Amino acid sequence: AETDVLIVGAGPAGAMSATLLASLGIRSLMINRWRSTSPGPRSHIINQRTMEILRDIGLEESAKSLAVPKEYMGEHVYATSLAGEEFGRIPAWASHPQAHAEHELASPSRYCDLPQLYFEPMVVSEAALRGADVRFLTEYLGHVEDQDGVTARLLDHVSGAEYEVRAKYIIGADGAHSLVAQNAGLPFEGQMGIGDSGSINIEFSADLSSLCEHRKGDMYYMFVAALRMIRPWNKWICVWGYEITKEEAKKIIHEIIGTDEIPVEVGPISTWTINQQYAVRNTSGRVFCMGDAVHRHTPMGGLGLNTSVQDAYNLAWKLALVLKGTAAPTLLDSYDAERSPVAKQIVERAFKSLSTFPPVFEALSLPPAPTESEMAEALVRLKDASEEGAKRRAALRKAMDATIIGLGGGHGVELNQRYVSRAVFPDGTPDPGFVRDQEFFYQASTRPGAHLPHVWLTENQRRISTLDLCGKGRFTLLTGLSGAAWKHEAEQVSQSLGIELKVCVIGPGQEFVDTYGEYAKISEIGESGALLVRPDMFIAFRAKDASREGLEQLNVAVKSILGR
Amino acid sequence: AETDVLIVGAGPAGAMSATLLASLGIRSLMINRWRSTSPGPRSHIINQRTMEILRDIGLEESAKSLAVPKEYMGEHVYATSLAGEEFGRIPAWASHPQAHAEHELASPSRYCDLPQLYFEPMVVSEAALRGADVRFLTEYLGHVEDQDGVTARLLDHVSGAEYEVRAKYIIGADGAHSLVAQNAGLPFEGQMGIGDSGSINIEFSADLSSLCEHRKGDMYYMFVAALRMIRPWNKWICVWGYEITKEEAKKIIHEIIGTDEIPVEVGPISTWTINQQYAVRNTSGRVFCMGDAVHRHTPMGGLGLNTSVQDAYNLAWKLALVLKGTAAPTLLDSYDAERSPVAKQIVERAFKSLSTFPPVFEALSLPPAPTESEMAEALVRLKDASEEGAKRRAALRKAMDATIIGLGGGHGVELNQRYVSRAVFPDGTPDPGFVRDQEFFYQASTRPGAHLPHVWLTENQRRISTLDLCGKGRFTLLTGLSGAAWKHEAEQVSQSLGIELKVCVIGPGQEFVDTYGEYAKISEIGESGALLVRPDMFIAFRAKDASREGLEQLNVAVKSILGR
Amino acid sequence: AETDVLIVGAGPAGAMSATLLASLGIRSLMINRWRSTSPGPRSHIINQRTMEILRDIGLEESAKSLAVPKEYMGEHVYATSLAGEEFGRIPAWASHPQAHAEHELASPSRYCDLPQLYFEPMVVSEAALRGADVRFLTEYLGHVEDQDGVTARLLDHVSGAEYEVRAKYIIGADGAHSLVAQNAGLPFEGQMGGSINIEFSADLSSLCEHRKGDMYYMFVAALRMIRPWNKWICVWGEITKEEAKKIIHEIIGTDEIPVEVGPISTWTINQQYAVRNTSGRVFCMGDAVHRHTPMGGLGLNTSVQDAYNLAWKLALVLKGTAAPTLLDSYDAERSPVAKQIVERAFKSLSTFPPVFEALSLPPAPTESEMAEALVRLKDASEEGAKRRAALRKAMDATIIGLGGGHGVELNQRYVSRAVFPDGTPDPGFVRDQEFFYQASTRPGAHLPHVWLTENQRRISTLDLCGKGRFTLLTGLSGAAWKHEAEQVSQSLGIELKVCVIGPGQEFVDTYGEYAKISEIGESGALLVRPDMFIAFRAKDASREGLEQLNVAVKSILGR
Ligand SMILES: Cc1cc2nc3c(=O)[nH]c(=O)nc-3n(C[C@H](O)[C@H](O)[C@H](O)COP(=O)(O)OP(=O)(O)OC[C@H]3O[C@@H](n4cnc5c(N)ncnc54)[C@H](O)[C@@H]3O)c2cc1C
Ligand SMILES: Cc1cc2nc3c(=O)[nH]c(=O)nc-3n(C[C@H](O)[C@H](O)[C@H](O)COP(=O)(O)OP(=O)(O)OC[C@H]3O[C@@H](n4cnc5c(N)ncnc54)[C@H](O)[C@@H]3O)c2cc1C
Ligand SMILES: Cc1cc2nc3c(=O)[nH]c(=O)nc-3n(C[C@H](O)[C@H](O)[C@H](O)COP(=O)(O)OP(=O)(O)OC[C@H]3O[C@@H](n4cnc5c(N)ncnc54)[C@H](O)[C@@H]3O)c2cc1C
């Protein structure tokens, strides 16, 4: 067997890698050890960046059809049981109107709930239909790198046969115990969170619409076990901290529903164990790891799947340009530089969220483990008509509010990627800062290294996002009428370098129109300046004006970005 | 390699076979020669029976989310071009209110438009997630039957390796040139339709919502080329009768749109060639063929995919009962008996529809091939203010009306399955007839051999169909309060035979309630009578009353149905 | 004071009369004794004919905004209480798919639920905004007819003043104790044959949303939706205390939804119909000429249709384009509708009693008697079967009064001087004419609905017509009709629009459903009154066919 890229792993990072490469005409073989995509929905939260990627490759409309919308997600209930009395609620998944506005402003896409159970086959299917070879029941066993490519050895769980694959690169998308990361010898750090422990996950079916429809929520937390909607509102899952459990789980569930009179049907029961670590480096020679393979962490914030897919989006177009000989192999160095700091920041963030929960119990004057008599008292203490009862209600409210960082509040974490690499050609301006907390709030930036900011233009008097002008596996140059020279400069650069760069001259009477003036407003530069946008939506070059010197630079920057 | 059932082919008949078997705990391996599910949407019409199957295995809600609804499908336009003047319209896909009522009455499910492009991965994915092994890039080469099973030889298009699979049965779901049907030596009949010829199919993208949204339709026919919505209303395909075609197709398209000012983007271009035949027998020893493998025909009526899936639904539960030793292998004889007559009837029906089109041209006083001057005159002749112009307008209207048999009018064809086999235990009543034309109109029947009729009951004051009580890979017995004895008779029969049969006693204060009285009305028998329903929704046994003799029979009928 | 038409009464028949007359440029003065439109919800069902009238004067979209749509309306529950066990359901208001199809086929409009409480001000408002003078707190006291008009005496409940109004005609829209009908001396018949109504508020959505119904009958008190699902009224067949809340809790079968008891009012019908609706210059309509049970909700709907029949006639006569003989048709056509609806509404009362007999229940049941019958019904016996079937049969038969009388609603058949007969015999109803609408293009019938297109958009044959004028429908081969209609129009001084339906025309028979429903050649014509009724039908465009249009119009107009 021979391919250009062997993709070990078929979860979110692998499938997306296969889909993007195929889209770019790169031959790839993607392998999974197991029979199917993943039996249970491990991750459900889809952030804006993932939706943006889905939009760019034309899969957002399917993702949207399938997924529960944002409006359903908002009501996060803390309570004793589902049918019991609430302690309080918090506006999760950006459902507070101010959060929602900040959310809407940051992207054309929105939060939805879409379980991995559904997300994966949707992407594996599209990988297959696009150029990509896909082969499950096939186990990566190891590989040996030489100067020209790699040779992987595979074990075929249908035939019993074993075989080799020759490839130019290997992507290690092989999950939380990446054998590909071991064999490439990737250093890992931040091993210690607390003592290693995970969770237990029980799927079930029951029609609790009568308890959910007035107060629609992605999750309901009981003091700590979580009830998470899989479909609204009949498919569910109970999660709690941590182990063999029988069809007694069915009592636990009843007690988590606070009532034993909805018919329940207990599905599968799985345990999730996490050792929290991030790879210091994600690349070794011809090997590139991504997804859980380089960042292993708590589910808090649901950053994993989303960061996993973004790893794939960073790498794909880079592999493709190198494979085609339009970019030097040095281009592949910026994968580690851009995407390695994201791996540490998200493991650290996901862990830090866990510490926002104890204060909820403290507010309740509760120990880490509480007797029901203990918990029943805390509820009484909470309806106390005294100033001490006030202080207490306020303390609980403050404690609850603080958990939001892990439940839709980390907009800054989701969006604020800053890239420093050879891939990103610096424009000479200093880094401006975040005016506000950079974990809670997205700050739009057009400085090289930042994601292209969203704003609405029109095409045929119809709204189109600045993002929809870009991507599609190519470089795009955005300017305005006074920067007409960019067209020509971009033509000469594209001929000489054998690369595709589309230029869009936004303005009145043009194909794309700055009809709300929001482009002029967000660009940070004169009408005649230009922004150059990577196939992965990131700005790699910024021009203040169309002046000759400004025009001359474009070539220097592209060459530099390509390693040429 | 070893499996119980080798499934050659991964299209609609194979995937559905794999999904159902897996659901029944039967080990299966399903193989496809190619990289992906199918690149283009060959078949889009999903009839009620398919929707019913999707409902029973819990995939209807996904099918529905993904698919264009019935209301969109109705407006069938005949015209010169999309932007030109209509000749007339017909209420396609049962959009006439009387058609719609007949439609709604016949099933809990409804027509939708869902291209194969989407349908296939949805089912292949669910097969995989359920027990089934699935392996693409693997070619069936032949097999040799012996007394105990079969040995297939496979060619692996990734490894280059070749290998054997041992299986107890083989399903030949391998399409219009089934190698499995050749090797099993299946006789084929009705070879001659006319001279063998097919069609050319051009995918394209364009935003013709401005020409489609006021008059929403599944297809637009131009005098004969068809414009078919893939997604509304921006993805499309042109089909005409028939050959290399370049990016000139793009002119053809413009002329089929009647205008050259919507931006068009020309996708893939494929040719469909059909030799119309049906297999006289679908079974030979341990081999069972289904789908296009046993019925090859015109798309008129879109019966293929739907009949293909129904073939799978007939067989699966039968294989499973035999594989488990609860049924004799004789049980497998009724596959040919029930499903072979469906194969001939649908090839013949699909062909016969083609002859409803010429009279449209005759009404137009048009030759088989017409010069534009010829066609432009016919339009003039049609606005003529004379009695001869009247006769002409009426003739065209009559001609157009008659095409409906192939565009949603064949409800009888879709639903009127009648089964005679060992599987179906006859109750002694004669065959009642169809009061109305049996190709246009569904006639509900509870006589053994017919599909269980749909009507609404309630469960928790919520509507539930008689169909939702049944299926799930088991036998179900429906009766009423006065037939309480059925419970016990069914218990004794199920113990002694080692089989699952669920009994539902419908009535007031019961789990399921005949709240509209529609069950009493549709059942054709006293409250105390029983209907026994196969896992495939077909009635196999009918009891007039709970009398001892009536009660004694149940055992005789089940034994007989199982071959025991 | 002076006006052309004094409209006594401001309910549905009066307001609609004022609105239509104003629309036709006729001066009218509509009065009403009371402060407001009516406080009570009263009649709620709006049938297709009323909806079509609302469509024609451009008020359907507003009617549809206010109203509960048909899809809410279908689940008719019979039960012990709202929160108790159902006996069964029936598909009310044409919710059975076959009923629904028959319904949808008969008209562009559909059943909705819109309480009088809302319907009335919407129409009184539109009367006022269109030419009409409207004056509440003003009581008709009597009148005296002479040769040239009438003089009504009015009592003004604001000023205390009393005053005279001179008018050409008087419409007696003054309700179930018409003083206008008494003074005109209208004979009444069918004097051969009261309810209490309690409004309340309560959020019973938890009991109603999975089973969406216009009404819930308890065994016999009715729960009726005012707004879904927090507004309610309890009806059954005298004083009441605040104990009324107690009755309501037991009708809800539970006392745990907060309830808020609104007004409490009694309805006391005396069932009669007027043999004649017209005397000299007086014309009565609405409850004034047909008084009956609510069964079928035909009253309001028939009331408005009375107004639609008369208005364009008064207008034509008032303008001198029609002889006063044209007014004679109003009794000829509307009076048989008045008897047929009183008789129908009463006959529906007979269906309910069997439902008890199926239950082996006395007319007045005790809670134990009625607890036994529910046991008797879950019995696992052949005699339990016969009984569950007897109850189902009994329940099914009530549907004639709950959406099943489509024939009653639509099957109007006018014979009179305002309908020019075409020589064909009356064809019959192939099916029961109380349950099933039968479309007809024979003169005397309502113009049948089918869809044409205009700009490739669906438009009903009805939308081509009306608008207070005569319309002539034909096809391309009947092009001569346009000229014949112009000559006739000029000579008679009366507007008649001609529509030549066909390919390349303004209106197109795009589905061929016109050719199919018309009953005549492409070159034939149908002439449609301002009230949607066919008054003339020609088979083809022959000279004799053409020459007859003028005879028919002259004849219709009385000239
Ligand atoms: C039970 C469970 C529950 C979870 N719940 C949540 C949650 O509630 N919220 C949340 O945010 N996150 C959750 N996660 C985390 C989530 O699954 C990860 O973020 C995500 O699946 C990792 O993406 P990935 O594609 O990098 O890795 P994976 O999705 O694990 O993909 C790795 C792939 O590589 C394949 N593979 C592994 N080894 C080999 C080999 N030797 N040869 C060939 N193929 C191989 C595997 O079969 C797999 O298909 C959960 C994970 C699990 C297991
Ligand atoms: C281009 C095209 C357009 C069409 N358009 C329409 C339309 O507009 N309307 C309509 O009603 N119908 C249409 N059809 C018909 C429709 O495709 C069939 O009804 C349906 O796909 C057949 O179902 P099936 O699963 O039995 O066969 P298929 O879907 O053909 O499945 C057969 C499978 O077996 C596999 N296979 C074949 N040989 C081997 C082998 N030796 N080893 C292993 N695997 C093998 C194939 O890869 C394939 O996956 C179209 C068909 C085509 C090809
Ligand atoms: C309490 C009640 C409940 C009802 N419930 C239902 C129901 O549930 N379902 C149903 O189908 N039908 C019901 N009806 C019937 C419905 O109200 C009638 O069909 C409808 O109101 C009659 O329309 P109308 O305009 O002809 O009469 P009305 O609506 O009574 O209009 C007559 C108008 O004339 C005015 N008037 C009377 N006398 C004089 C005078 N001397 N001077 C000036 N003005 C005068 C009155 O104020 C009134 O506004 C109910 C009627 C009542 C009274």
Side-chain angles (χ1 to χ4, degrees), chain C residues 6-16 30-38 40-45 93 116 120 135-142 153-155 157 172-180 195 197 215 224 233 235 265-269 285-304 306 341:
Chain C
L6 155 55
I7 294 184
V8 190
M16 184 56 68
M30 173 173 87
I31 64 172
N32 180 6
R33 178 193 272 153
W34 312 115
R35 211 194 319 100
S36 63
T37 68
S38 79
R42 287 171 76 179
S43 167
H44 48 298
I45 309 271
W93 314 117
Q116 246 185 280
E120 289 193 22
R135 186 48 81 83
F136 286 32
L137 289 174
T138 306
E139 185 179 6
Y140 164 87
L141 298 180
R153 280 179 297 120
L154 305 186
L155 164 60
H157 290 251
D174 52 341
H177 303 100
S178 188
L179 176 51
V180 177
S195 70
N197 304 71
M215 285 175 61
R224 173 165 84 73
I233 185 156
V235 187
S265 295
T266 68
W267 191 22
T268 203
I269 295 119
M285 52 163 61
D287 269 24
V289 296
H290 38 70
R291 303 104 186 236
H292 54 81
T293 91
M295 223 72 75
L298 297 155
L300 185 161
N301 294 298
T302 312
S303 295
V304 166
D306 295 339
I341 72 145

Side-chain angles (χ1 to χ4, degrees), chain A residues 8-14 31-34 38 41-44 116 120 138-141 173-177 179 201 228 270-272 290-293 297-305 308:
Chain A
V8 190
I31 62 157
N32 186 5
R33 151 75 172 78
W34 312 107
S38 295
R42 326 167 164 346
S43 163
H44 53 291
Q116 253 180 280
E120 293 183 350
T138 306
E139 185 179 6
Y140 162 84
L141 298 180
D174 52 341
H177 303 100
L179 176 51
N201 289 1
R228 158 155 90 81
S270 64
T271 62
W272 187 25
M290 52 163 61
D292 265 26
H297 54 81
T298 91
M300 270 320 138
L303 297 155
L305 185 161
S308 295

Side-chain angles (χ1 to χ4, degrees), chain B residues 320-479:
Chain B
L321 284 183
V322 167
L323 279 169
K324 289 171 186 189
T326 284
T330 47
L331 172 43
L332 309 175
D333 289 345
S334 54
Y335 176 73
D336 175 52
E338 301 153 1
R339 296 291 287 172
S340 259
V342 185
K344 169 184 180 183
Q345 154 197 58
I346 73 144
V347 169
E348 279 173 350
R349 209 333 126 190
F351 173 63
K352 184 177 183 184
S353 294
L354 301 186
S355 68
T356 61
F357 290 98
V360 169
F361 293 81
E362 296 153 16
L364 281 177
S365 178
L366 295 174
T371 69
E372 203 295 315
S373 85
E374 183 65 13
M375 153 136 179
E377 251 160 4
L379 177 63
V380 184
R381 290 198 296 292
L382 202 71
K383 291 164 62 181
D384 184 269
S386 82
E387 304 285 319
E388 187 73 19
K391 266 173 193 53
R392 221 189 247 102
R393 285 178 279 275
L396 172 70
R397 173 40 68 178
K398 180 199 222 241
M400 284 183 308
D401 287 342
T403 71
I404 186 137
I405 175 60
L407 304 160
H411 202 209
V413 182
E414 289 155 0
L415 267 34
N416 283 341
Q417 289 84 44
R418 294 296 185 258
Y419 286 174
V420 187
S421 75
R422 271 302 151 164
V424 167
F425 190 81
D427 75 345
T429 76
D431 184 19
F434 299 75
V435 172
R436 281 156 122 199
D437 182 302
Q438 64 172 42
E439 295 181 281
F440 276 85
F441 301 108
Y442 168 68
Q443 171 157 324
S445 180
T446 60
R447 183 176 178 270
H451 192 285
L452 178 61
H454 166 68
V455 307
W456 291 117
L457 309 165
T458 68
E459 184 176 14
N460 182 14
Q461 293 186 353
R462 272 83 187 167
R463 256 139 97 127
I464 184 176
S465 167
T466 44
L467 276 45
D468 301 325
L469 277 51
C470 297
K472 293 179 179 179
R474 48 136 161 88
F475 284 87
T476 296
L477 186 146
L478 310 190
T479 183

Side-chain angles (χ1 to χ4, degrees), chain B residues 8-14 31-34 36 38 41-45 116 120 138-141 173-179 199 201 228 239 270-272 290-293 295 297-306 308:
Chain B
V8 190
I31 62 157
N32 186 5
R33 151 75 172 78
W34 312 107
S36 63
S38 295
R42 326 167 164 346
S43 163
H44 53 291
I45 307 274
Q116 253 180 280
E120 293 183 350
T138 306
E139 185 179 6
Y140 162 84
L141 298 180
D174 52 341
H177 303 100
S178 183
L179 176 51
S199 74
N201 289 1
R228 158 155 90 81
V239 190
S270 64
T271 62
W272 187 25
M290 52 163 61
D292 265 26
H295 38 70
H297 54 81
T298 91
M300 270 320 138
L303 297 155
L305 185 161
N306 294 298
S308 295

Side-chain angles (χ1 to χ4, degrees), chain A residues 386-440:
Chain A
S386 82
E387 304 285 319
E388 187 73 19
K391 266 173 193 53
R392 221 189 247 102
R393 285 178 279 275
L396 172 70
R397 173 40 68 178
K398 180 199 222 241
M400 284 183 308
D401 287 342
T403 71
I404 186 137
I405 175 60
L407 304 160
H411 202 209
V413 182
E414 289 155 0
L415 267 34
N416 283 341
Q417 289 84 44
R418 294 296 185 258
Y419 286 174
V420 187
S421 75
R422 271 302 151 164
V424 167
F425 190 81
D427 75 345
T429 76
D431 184 19
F434 299 75
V435 172
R436 281 156 122 199
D437 182 302
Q438 64 172 42
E439 295 181 281
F440 276 85

Side-chain angles (χ1 to χ4, degrees), chain B residues 75 89 95 97 214, chain C residues 55 104 451-460 463 511:
Chain B
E75 301 299 321
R89 300 182 195 173
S95 54
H214 53 290
Chain C
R55 190 193 181 89
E104 180 166 12
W451 291 117
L452 309 165
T453 75
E454 182 173 17
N455 181 32
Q456 293 186 353
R457 271 83 168 171
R458 261 141 95 128
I459 185 176
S460 166
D463 301 325
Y511 308 95

